[PDB]
Design an enzyme around this catalytic site. Sequence first.
Site, short mmCIF file in Angstrom:
data_model
loop_
_atom_site.label_atom_id
_atom_site.label_comp_id
_atom_site.label_asym_id
_atom_site.label_seq_id
_atom_site.Cartn_x
_atom_site.Cartn_y
_atom_site.Cartn_z
N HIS A 198 -47.72 11.79 -17.66
CA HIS A 198 -46.88 11.37 -16.46
C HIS A 198 -47.12 12.52 -15.53
CE1 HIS A 198 -43.50 14.48 -16.45
NE2 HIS A 198 -43.37 14.34 -17.64
N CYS A 199 -46.84 12.09 -14.37
CA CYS A 199 -46.73 13.11 -13.28
C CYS A 199 -45.59 12.74 -12.46
CB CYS A 199 -48.11 12.78 -12.29
SG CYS A 199 -48.45 11.08 -11.61
N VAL A 200 -45.36 12.54 -11.11
CA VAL A 200 -44.18 12.36 -10.52
C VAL A 200 -44.11 10.89 -10.32
CG1 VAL A 200 -42.82 12.89 -8.37
CG2 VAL A 200 -44.12 14.69 -9.30
N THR B 275 -51.53 10.66 -12.94
CA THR B 275 -51.69 10.13 -14.21
C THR B 275 -52.70 9.18 -14.32
OG1 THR B 275 -49.59 10.38 -14.63
CG2 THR B 275 -50.27 8.63 -15.70
#
Length: 160
Positions: free
Chosen positions: A95-97, A103
């Site tokens: 995950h990223c933001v 991602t």
Amino acid sequence: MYWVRRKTIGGSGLPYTENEILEWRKEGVKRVLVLPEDWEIEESWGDKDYYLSILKKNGLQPLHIPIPDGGVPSDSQFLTIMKWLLSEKEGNLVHCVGGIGRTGTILASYLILTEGLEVESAIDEVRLVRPGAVQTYEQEMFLLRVEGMRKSWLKNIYSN
């Protein structure tokens, strides 16, 4: 979240609540590759260590490899990421933001390395489940490089 290869590797954005993390667990997530930077995590969780502790409390094994928005892992980060994702192959979440650029790039690079996909095909495979995945020039150039260097990346990943 979304699965790119069902139950093996998937993606998400940054959770804001523990309910979202519980849902990951229900979906079969076992391990989480955390890509946001500290400042991004701290906005939603106060402290990066607290966030990772909430992941662990929920039975997930985390690894923090911070990548700036719009960016790509460094070569050492990427080696570490791929060793992590291939060490225990099932139940991986990245995950990223937003779950889209950072991602998507990692997930596309995983398909390039593991399946031998061409760049465009790998991006398209992620976009089937995550519209817009892989967002920036820098991310596209990184995937080009990974594809061209597939053999040497795999040698280094599976060393030791």
